[PDB]
Amino acid sequence: RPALLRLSDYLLTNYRKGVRPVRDWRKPTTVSIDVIVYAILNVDEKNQVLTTYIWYRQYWTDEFLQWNPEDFDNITKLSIPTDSIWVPDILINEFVDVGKSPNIPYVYIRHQGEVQNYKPLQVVTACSLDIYNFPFDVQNCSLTFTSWLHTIQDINISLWRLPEKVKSDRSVFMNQGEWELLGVLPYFREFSMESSNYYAEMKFYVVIRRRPLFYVVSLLLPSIFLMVMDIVGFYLPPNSGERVSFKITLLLGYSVFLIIVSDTLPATAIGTPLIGVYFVVCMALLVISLAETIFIVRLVLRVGSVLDKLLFHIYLLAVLAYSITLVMLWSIWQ
Amino acid sequence: RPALLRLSDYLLTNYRKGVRPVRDWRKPTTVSIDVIVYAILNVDEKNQVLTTYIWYRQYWTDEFLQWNPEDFDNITKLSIPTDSIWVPDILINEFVDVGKSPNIPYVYIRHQGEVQNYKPLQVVTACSLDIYNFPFDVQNCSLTFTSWLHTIQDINISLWRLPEKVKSDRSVFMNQGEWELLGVLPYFREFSMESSNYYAEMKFYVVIRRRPLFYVVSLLLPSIFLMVMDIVGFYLPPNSGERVSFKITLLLGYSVFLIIVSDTLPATAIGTPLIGVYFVVCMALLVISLAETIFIVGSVLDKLLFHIYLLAVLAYSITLVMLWSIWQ
Amino acid sequence: RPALLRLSDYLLTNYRKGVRPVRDWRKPTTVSIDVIVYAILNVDEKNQVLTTYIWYRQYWTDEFLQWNPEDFDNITKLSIPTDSIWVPDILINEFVDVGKSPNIPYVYIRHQGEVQNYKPLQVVTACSLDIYNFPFDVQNCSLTFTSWLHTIQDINISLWRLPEKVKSDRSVFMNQGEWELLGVLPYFREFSMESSNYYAEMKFYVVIRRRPLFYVVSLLLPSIFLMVMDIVGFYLPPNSGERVSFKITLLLGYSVFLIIVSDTLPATAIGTPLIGVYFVVCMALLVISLAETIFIVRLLRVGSVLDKLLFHIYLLAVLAYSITLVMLWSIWQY
Amino acid sequence: RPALLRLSDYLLTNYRKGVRPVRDWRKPTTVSIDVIVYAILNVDEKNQVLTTYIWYRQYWTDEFLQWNPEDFDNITKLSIPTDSIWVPDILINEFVDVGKSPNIPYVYIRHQGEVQNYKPLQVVTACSLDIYNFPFDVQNCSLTFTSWLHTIQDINISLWRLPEKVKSDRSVFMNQGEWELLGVLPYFREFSMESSNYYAEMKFYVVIRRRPLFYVVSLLLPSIFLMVMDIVGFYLPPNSGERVSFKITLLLGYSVFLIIVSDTLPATAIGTPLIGVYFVVCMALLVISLAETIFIVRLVLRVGSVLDKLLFHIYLLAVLAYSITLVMLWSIWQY
Amino acid sequence: RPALLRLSDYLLTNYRKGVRPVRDWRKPTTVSIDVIVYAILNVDEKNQVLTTYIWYRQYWTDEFLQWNPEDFDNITKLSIPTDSIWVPDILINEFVDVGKSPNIPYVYIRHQGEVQNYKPLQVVTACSLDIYNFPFDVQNCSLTFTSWLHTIQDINISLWRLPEKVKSDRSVFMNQGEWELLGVLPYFREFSMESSNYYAEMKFYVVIRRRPLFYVVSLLLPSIFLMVMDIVGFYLPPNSGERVSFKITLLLGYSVFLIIVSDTLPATAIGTPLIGVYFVVCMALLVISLLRVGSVLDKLLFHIYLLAVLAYSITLVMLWSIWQY
Ligand SMILES: *[C@@H]1O[C@H](CO)[C@@H](O[C@@H]2O[C@H](CO)[C@@H](O)[C@H](O)[C@H]2NC(C)=O)[C@H](O)[C@H]1NC(C)=O
Ligand SMILES: *[C@@H]1O[C@H](CO)[C@@H](O[C@@H]2O[C@H](CO)[C@@H](O)[C@H](O)[C@H]2NC(C)=O)[C@H](O)[C@H]1NC(C)=O
Ligand SMILES: *[C@@H]1O[C@H](CO)[C@@H](O[C@@H]2O[C@H](CO)[C@@H](O)[C@H](O)[C@H]2NC(C)=O)[C@H](O)[C@H]1NC(C)=O
Ligand SMILES: *[C@@H]1O[C@H](CO)[C@@H](O[C@@H]2O[C@H](CO)[C@@H](O)[C@H](O)[C@H]2NC(C)=O)[C@H](O)[C@H]1NC(C)=O
Ligand SMILES: *[C@@H]1O[C@H](CO)[C@@H](O[C@@H]2O[C@H](CO)[C@@H](O)[C@H](O)[C@H]2NC(C)=O)[C@H](O)[C@H]1NC(C)=O
Ligand SMILES: *[C@@H]1O[C@H](CO)[C@@H](O[C@@H]2O[C@H](CO)[C@@H](O)[C@H](O)[C@H]2NC(C)=O)[C@H](O)[C@H]1NC(C)=O
Ligand SMILES: *[C@@H]1O[C@H](CO)[C@@H](O[C@@H]2O[C@H](CO)[C@@H](O)[C@H](O)[C@H]2NC(C)=O)[C@H](O)[C@H]1NC(C)=O
Ligand SMILES: *[C@@H]1O[C@H](CO)[C@@H](O[C@@H]2O[C@H](CO)[C@@H](O)[C@H](O)[C@H]2NC(C)=O)[C@H](O)[C@H]1NC(C)=O
Ligand SMILES: *[C@@H]1O[C@H](CO)[C@@H](O[C@@H]2O[C@H](CO)[C@@H](O)[C@H](O)[C@H]2NC(C)=O)[C@H](O)[C@H]1NC(C)=O
Ligand SMILES: *[C@@H]1O[C@H](CO)[C@@H](O[C@@H]2O[C@H](CO)[C@@H](O)[C@H](O)[C@H]2NC(C)=O)[C@H](O)[C@H]1NC(C)=O
Ligand SMILES: *[C@@H]1O[C@H](CO)[C@@H](O)[C@H](O)[C@H]1NC(C)=O
Ligand SMILES: *[C@@H]1O[C@H](CO)[C@@H](O)[C@H](O)[C@H]1NC(C)=O
């Protein structure tokens, strides 16, 4: 019979999945995992979940699937169905849906007993997505692979590659998209909330930052244009109907702009972005100034002049704060 | 042969899944259970369901999976596939969808026959959600685990931990989110719809309250500002065009505010919050005042409508104080 | 050996599923059934479907799963996996999707052979859902259970309980919700698609009615407010500018109310509700009234009689609307 | 042992599913099929797919599942699990989802070897749903059942009932709905992806037509009402601000009408409905007439009067064409 | 026993799925594949996923499933369940969902050992869609098939048909739809995630373009009508009520046009559609009303409007030109 067929028979007719493959039960099975991010398919700041398509590969030593290549025509490694052998139950804690990814029927066995398992994960995980810096926003999400049942005495987890490689690896990442990732940071720890159970878990912090240009052109530049134009409402003659008409029309322009803002901004219930805070503050200041003009026009002057200067100074202060905040947010993002 | 392999063969060679594991059929199988809420993924007040991600673990005594460690290299406990042993039919009654949780292949067996089963559940359950206090909600609805088929003299349920410990347990809860849970309250009862049969069930009341600050900033403060502006608007005489122009400005503000609210205020079919009632009442008063001004430009109507407006704002104000008081 | 273990072996090592469990093939298997409605999750008038959560239980006599208790330590009842025995193919015809229900691994067996099977069903079924009486809706559609393949000479269906007990059963219904059920009505008939075969089917009519209060407050009362406002307005002089102003302002308000209704009224294409038709009619009648004043004021005996005719016609329409509301409530209350 | 049990053991003990049940491999397996449409659950003119709940039943001769009734207590037929026997891979083309139908565990076997398989299919398939005639629209969507792998040398398809009996079959159709079906027309043909292989397929053309009354009431009557109001508006003099205000309010009525209609007028990208074209052309005519009126007001006249009458005539002609196209669409929809 | 039954018995009694079917393990298994696009079911730019329903067929030589026809009643070909034999793990990369593909129980075997597997794939894949030219879009989305686990030393991929034939093949495409595909371009390369290992993969570039006529009728012509009317309205004086009435007329026109737009115009965060910005810009500019200063700001505004419309026209011509060729 051919080498592959009789080798597979030799291995799997004696093998019995369902028992951790160690001939000394005190020895833990060390699962060396690795993660390569392929694409951040989706990021719901509304639902506080994100969908990451990651190529996940892990290997472990199976002490029963060993053979001498000299007896089997120099076969160094062979592929066998994944469901035919014991597979560690490594699982990611913050999953929200098991995922719609395929099964990848096969795994590789090397004559040393090492089992290599490559599988794609279209995992969607709960995440603390915060849009406080909306346009210049950097999200720091994490994935935590942990042996769900087995304690560290049974299954331990480690990195396949050196940490420096996995941090900087962006070989196959789909760069085009709303998000670009700066790196995935591994971190090992012995999770434990129990009297005598310590579970090994491997955290990967996937750092991703939004690329703002579309939002810069859509929100920031028009908002800056409107805020700059609003300064002119304070150089037109103080109580003229011309000035009141100007302020009314620019308030209408701001109001219609905020509709586009509502359309464009991502929905959330955790916290409003600073951009929205400044927009609504400017709207309130403009309304107050317009009301002051309306009232003073009803009356009329000295009070009007001093109030006008006060409102102009507060408006200038607000717009300066907004611009400095934009610069600061950009500095944080880069 | 290695101890693990021959121990597994010894246990499972003659084992027969599908029979309740007791050597005296009169004894009930007591399934001790525990629940830890990991995250409240979604609360939907239109579909009246909420999705919670919970770490559910349970253990029971399987009287056939027993061995002396002396014969098996002092193997005190081992893991074997979950599908290879009898597993109790504990089910959550008010589930709406089975969920998308994984299968968790293995379970632990201790040499005394105790089987420990840990499994994550993304349960989606029906609940009597109400948004009467929308920004200051405190929802309170149950998860009840019961043996679906087996009566109490076949399967019985109990708590793994003391009730107070599970009640105060928030070790792993994912805090950052719209909902924070005040506690889960266990409660045991013998359900029955026909006297010949009694069923053991264990209710867990997950108590969660919305953290309002986002809606305080986004909804309450702009509405308060607009109400204050409309109140000040009445200092202009009705016979003055300034008043109608100012009213138009505030109606434009309310249009913008309503559009923003549409993106945020929850939809439902059972009833809107008091906040919505006050919103529409204030908008109606503003519109009626605009009609009054455009009609004038009956003078006592000015101060009458102003008093109604002042009354509404005060009612709106004390409602917020009351709702906040309940929220604490 | 323990009693349960050897009893289960004795039964299921000889037993073979697939074959209908009857030792005389000329005898049909009578499958008693029962249904308890747990909740009405979703009634969709756009898709013309509704989703109900029902606790469905059925029992039948299996003539091979019988034993003498004396031989098995007086075991008079035991549980065995549902997939280890013949399970009748009782299926629901109106189904549109099987649903998200679990599988309930086990069933009960009594020593005389009767098998008890309990299973929850998330049935979603096609139904003719008309909203003609929208606020005071009462719906009438049904669920029919029938052996999909087997004729009545193989499988016949029957009620577990007396018809009046299932009819009045509201022991577990989730009452808090948009819909309340008035009862479930069983009805047995021998369906026959082709003259050579007869099939047993058991129709359950799940009668439900909407609880209107939210829609009564949200739609009906504001609508009547607007309509009575128009009636009040008709008191103004015919050619007066006040009359035209009132008409046009009420047009704006009523149109925005129609927009609100569109936002709130359920979507459908099978048919418009009466409430909707009267709204549209009265709007059109108002537009005719408004259009009329433009000609008359532009150009008064003709105006006066024309105004009187319009006023009386609109008042008659208002009365018809109110009487329609009384009729709809009278039907829904009983 | 009981007759059923030993008969089942006699049949299925040595039965080897997977192999086509024919004892002379050269003979094809003729799979007779039938289809009864139960309900047209959803026609999606946006996505150009529809979902039809159809009761599908097929039978074929299995040469190995044969027995002599006298030897087994005179049993003429029995039911056995569907997964225990060879089942032809008759598959519908142009599907978009495998469907949400159950598994129907059992099939009937008759002693001659005929296997009967009844199964409900929640098929969702692609057809070119052209809504040109939207309110009075008749769609001719098709289902084709074909042995996905096996060529005609292995599996051949045929009708269970006479073609006219299936063409006029509405025995169990759920008629209360937006769509009513005029019939399903069978048509056999031998497809050939490459001339070396010939594939037998059975096309059923399900013909369905929208019942318009809802759309009549909600769209066409209000549209006629607004158009008649616009025709009335032309009586007012062009020089009058009354006419300008009337036209502005009528245009606002147009706007609100279309706003509400957006909920019900189907979305699509294959082509605009004819009624939509008339809507937009009347809207544009109204707008341009109003603009000309405003300009002539600015001037304020002979040319003004001539253009007023000309625009009135064009509007009247457009309304006449609208009536003609409505009656035409209705005439086609009747047949 | 009948020929088919005992032939299946001979083949499958000692056959054991799992082992790559070669009697000399050093030989790679060459999986010839072919792909025919049947329909482009969806192009979702908001999620950047494209859904195509494609007829996928592949064949390979299984060196264990061989027989002499003379011994088995001259049977040259037979069908056996797909689950009963080794099947290569040819996986399409950049999938998003495994998809609603049916199981297709059977495959053909020919006495020389060739296995033919036909299966329909409803692949939904993530690829870079863009609506920069919305009404005149042309998209270039890839499908790449690769043996997920096996390296090129185990599984190698090739085309069933000649590249030009598969490229120009549009025999079964559902042509009556929003999208028409120009062709599918195959391309073979040895992917390498590590220096020591090489993976064979086969990219098919599906090239599709939106057919615009609907959007020309629905969007472009009405928008040009409204823009031309806005230009015309400038001749009414800047202080006059005639201009106000004209502006309200135009505003109602835009009110209808924008709901029509919202019902059809796609939106995504990757970038803007050049056509889309003008609509909202012009609708917003009705706010503008910019006596000595006003009368000349009006001419400035008129120049702005005219240049905007000129840019719109040349943009439409450009978009059509890049879409035609
Ligand atoms: C579980 O695995 C971790 C990771 O491999 C082990 O931690 C390493 O221990 C070695 C000891 O020589 C150190 O050199 C490494 O620096 C450690 N790595 C990290 C990330 O801390 C851990 O010792 C293992 N524990 C058990 C019980 O097997
Ligand atoms: C994302 O979060 C991770 C984890 O908190 C940060 O990584 C830590 O950074 C600090 C400061 O440089 C170090 O002292 C820790 O050792 C890091 N942890 C690990 C596991 O490497 C990371 O800096 C954050 N990045 C961003 C952009 O927020
Ligand atoms: C089923 O389980 C319940 C819950 O543990 C048992 O109820 C307890 O019984 C013990 C008996 O010693 C009491 O001390 C506890 O106070 C009971 N707890 C509660 C919450 O009632 C019950 O006895 C078990 N058996 C049966 C037949 O119900
Ligand atoms: C949530 O609902 C539960 C169930 O009604 C409440 O728990 C009960 O509260 C009452 C009043 O304090 C006690 O008498 C009962 O003993 C409690 N039952 C249990 C099982 O603990 C709970 O107080 C509610 N919480 C909120 C915040 O509404
Ligand atoms: C729902 O439909 C059922 C079936 O038509 C109605 O029940 C029938 O009502 C008629 C008239 O009262 C009786 O003669 C039948 O005997 C009833 N059938 C059964 C099985 O009881 C029922 O009335 C409908 N619901 C409503 C609210 O009208
Ligand atoms: C199938 O089952 C139904 C329901 O049990 C049978 O109908 C009953 O027939 C008996 C005959 O005496 C009547 O007394 C009952 O009132 C009937 N019940 C109902 C609900 O109508 C029916 O006879 C059975 N048919 C066969 C062929 O066995
Ligand atoms: C495959 O089946 C079709 C349909 O039954 C066969 O076509 C019919 O064959 C009969 C007998 O020759 C003719 O009377 C009919 O006119 C044919 N057409 C139809 C529509 O019935 C066809 O011959 C079969 N082919 C094979 C190879 O079995
Ligand atoms: C739907 O399409 C079918 C298939 O083209 C039409 O049926 C054909 O009609 C022509 C009319 O000349 C006949 O010559 C063919 O013989 C018919 N074929 C079949 C299989 O019956 C049908 O008329 C169309 N119906 C509608 C309403 O469009
Ligand atoms: C794997 O398959 C590819 C084809 O997909 C082989 O490449 C071909 O090799 C032949 C050798 O004569 C050339 O004529 C073709 O031009 C090649 N095609 C391409 C697309 O490069 C390749 O040799 C096979 N084996 C390996 C190890 O890659
Ligand atoms: C779609 O992308 C493919 C791949 O880049 C293009 O096809 C290649 O184009 C280059 C440049 O003209 C040629 O050198 C190659 O021979 C082409 N084929 C392959 C397989 O690379 C194709 O032109 C693109 N189509 C569109 C419309 O952008
Ligand atoms: C394995 O291959 C080497 C040459 O590469 C050969 O010398 C050796 O004999 C082979 N093994 C056996 C068992 O023949
Ligand atoms: C098992 O444990 C007992 C108690 O500690 C000890 O005496 C014995 O030597 C152990 N046996 C083995 C094989 O470890």
Ligand SMILES: *[C@@H]1O[C@H](CO)[C@@H](O)[C@H](O)[C@H]1NC(C)=O
């Ligand atoms: C079974 O129950 C009967 C009473 O019904 C009793 O007499 C008998 O002893 C019991 N048998 C056993 C083995 O307990």
Ligand SMILES: *[C@@H]1O[C@H](CO)[C@@H](O)[C@H](O)[C@H]1NC(C)=O
């Ligand atoms: C077998 O059944 C047929 C049909 O019912 C009947 O005519 C025949 O007499 C029966 N024969 C025997 C031996 O039962």
Ligand SMILES: *[C@@H]1O[C@H](CO)[C@@H](O)[C@H](O)[C@H]1NC(C)=O
């Ligand atoms: C077997 O079939 C082939 C098909 O071409 C034919 O040429 C050959 O003569 C046949 N041989 C026998 C023995 O039937």
